[PDB]
Design a protein around this ligand. Structure first.
Ligand code: 46T
Length: 330
């Protein structure tokens, strides 16, 4: 089998992407944030504290003939951005772009943190990291991908995120029309539960390529590109008027400035992020100071190839017995 679904930016800045997901019988369609950096499929629901729901579409398990309480199961998660959610668990039928998994753990939120409430466009998350990170207790649950894997034509999914435009998540096949050149595959460590790999280096604009190993994760659920302070400083030093602002919480720059591209290495191959992808707009409405899309990972404890990087590429998440990652230009 295969599946194919369009993913759409939630706003004009590509702060995140939402993908429609069918849950239950009859289908309840929720717009979920596909997150290769986590492993829980959780949803706003009829069980979510009323004061914490503000415009989201909710899953109502009592209206699904295929929903079953996963008796005794609870979940609780906290994300890198400080957000969190928790609740109980149902199993139900879940479909993404024509691909159906029966008995998928659907984690129903009883509580969500303010950032989730405040974002009316995201109805929940669909985790696509390794199932070892799943927070369901006492019985850890499998991701949608892990459940679908054996049925897929090939045990892979692909992320093809758009710049200020929709893109595509495919399951079970590689669309050879969706990228240029060849796909370069690179090793993955699953030891921390992430799609963790090692970039071979970077270049800033037309500058010479610096060969250096940069461990990091391929994370569709993170907006920006977070890299070591050395690398990030080298980038922003090429932008007139750029500075790191403690009050704003990262590098900012005047949008009268022109942003250089940023290149990252995948083996001997190179993915080029255009300068425009690194502009995240005014720090506040009407401000002449813009927020940068490349930021320091210092303090996070890991480098993160988030949407800024991933949307410059066609990315293969290869879930074979030995997982790997593939990157192609597009
Ligand atoms: C890219 C997006 C998620 N973040 C921002 C986007 C625009 C403006 C200001 C700040 C900002 N993050 C700060 C709070 C660290």
């Amino acid at each position: 089998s295969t599946g194919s679904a369009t993913t759409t930016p939630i706003d004009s800045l590509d702060d995140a992407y939402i993908t429609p997901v069918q849950i239950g019988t009859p289908a309840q369609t929720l717009n979920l944030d596909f997150d290769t950096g986590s492993s829980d499929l959780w949803v706003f629901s009829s069980e979510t504290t009323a004061s914490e729901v503000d415009g989201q579409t909710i899953y109502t398990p009592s209206k699904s003939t295929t929903a079953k309480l996963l008796s005794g199961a609870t979940w609780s998660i906290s994300y890198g951005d400080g957000s969190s959610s928790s609740g109980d668990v149902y199993t139900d039928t879940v479909s993404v772009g024509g691909l159906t998994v029966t008995g998928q753990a659907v984690e129903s939120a009883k509580k969500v943190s303010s950032s989730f409430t405040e974002d009316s466009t995201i109805d929940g998350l669909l985790g696509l990291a390794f199932s070892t990170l799943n927070t369901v207790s006492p019985t850890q649950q499998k991701t949608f991908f892990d459940n679908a894997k054996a049925s897929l034509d090939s045990p892979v999914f692909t992320a093809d995120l758009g710049y200020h435009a929709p893109g595509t998540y495919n399951f079970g096949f590689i669309d050879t029309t969706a990228y240029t050149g060849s796909i370069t595959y690179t090793a993955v460590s699953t030891k921390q539960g992430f799609w963790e790999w090692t970039s071979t280096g970077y270049a800033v604009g037309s500058g010479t390529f610096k060969s250096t190993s940069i461990d990091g994760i391929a994370d569709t659920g993170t907006t920006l590109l977070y890299l070591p302070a050395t690398v990030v400083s080298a980038y922003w030093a090429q932008v007139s008027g750029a500075k790191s602002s403690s009050s704003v919480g990262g590098y900012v720059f005047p949008c009268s400035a022109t942003l250089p591209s940023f290149t990252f290495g995948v083996g001997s191959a190179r993915i080029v992020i255009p300068g425009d992808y690194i502009d995240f707009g005014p720090i506040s409405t009407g401000s002449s100071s813009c927020f940068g899309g490349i930021q320091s990972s210092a303090g996070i404890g890991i480098n993160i190839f988030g949407d800024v990087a991933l949307k410059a590429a066609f990315v293969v998440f290869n879930g074979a017995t030995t997982p790997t990652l593939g990157f192609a230009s597009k």
